[PDB]
């Protein structure tokens, strides 16, 4: 509603960036939950180990019901109930479910690398002066990474910002780990510039500033400082974004307009 989806971010960026000079990449997305061997026992535990887990799930349901915050309660309870359903499946189906989960996670990390590499190919081989990559650090936690290339020094430079005021190391250095996995073998290590500019602490505003930061960084212009970001700037940007959207795609203007 208030929260931007990748669809708007991509359109807003494309609409405000010369495609001959700038390439807008599809989003790099990270899960915010870690996969653990213990979590997977929901799929692999059999016999008594399985019975013990089903037992704890059923107890959780009984307690999760009591969580005082209504929104938090619904989330924890819904997930416990889902877990109960999973534990009730056949061993064979729990196994397929686990494999689906692992397949998706593997796809996600390979696709994330491919986007970083494509962005790098764009600025290094295809004449683009910037590649803009929207980065989702978690559900709706939109941030931006802009890739540029100094040919004279054969040097890749990546510029990041998180409008909420987190560093690029947010959530266990997942993004720097990706960058180094993908590009840490280049003749010259990628230089990382973290703008670390807190702009607005509403998670609703992440997509608004992701767009504005990406555009500005792409063009070599200073992003909106903490000072300029105060007040109704997030609103004005959002209104402005709805106009740009309206000047083509009406349904996404209406989305950005909703309250939440």
Residue numbers in the entry: 423 to 682
Sentences from the paper on this structure:
CE clan proteases, specific hydrolases for ubiquitin-like modifications (SUMO and NEDD8) in eukaryotes, reportedly serve as bacterial effector proteins with deSUMOylase, deubiquitinase, or, even, acetyltransferase activities. Here, we characterize bacterial CE protease activities, revealing K63-linkage-specific deubiquitinases in human pathogens, such as Salmonella, Escherichia, and Shigella, as well as ubiquitin/ubiquitin-like cross-reactive enzymes in Chlamydia, Rickettsia, and Xanthomonas. Five crystal structures, including ubiquitin/ubiquitin-like complexes, explain substrate specificities and redefine relationships across the CE clan. A comparison to the previously determined SENP2-SUMO2 and NEDP1∼NEDD8 complexes (Reverter and Lima, 2004, Reverter et al., 2005, Shen et al., 2005) revealed differences among bacterial CE DUBs in three variable regions (VRs) near the substrate binding (S1) site that were arranged around a structurally conserved helix (constant region, CR).
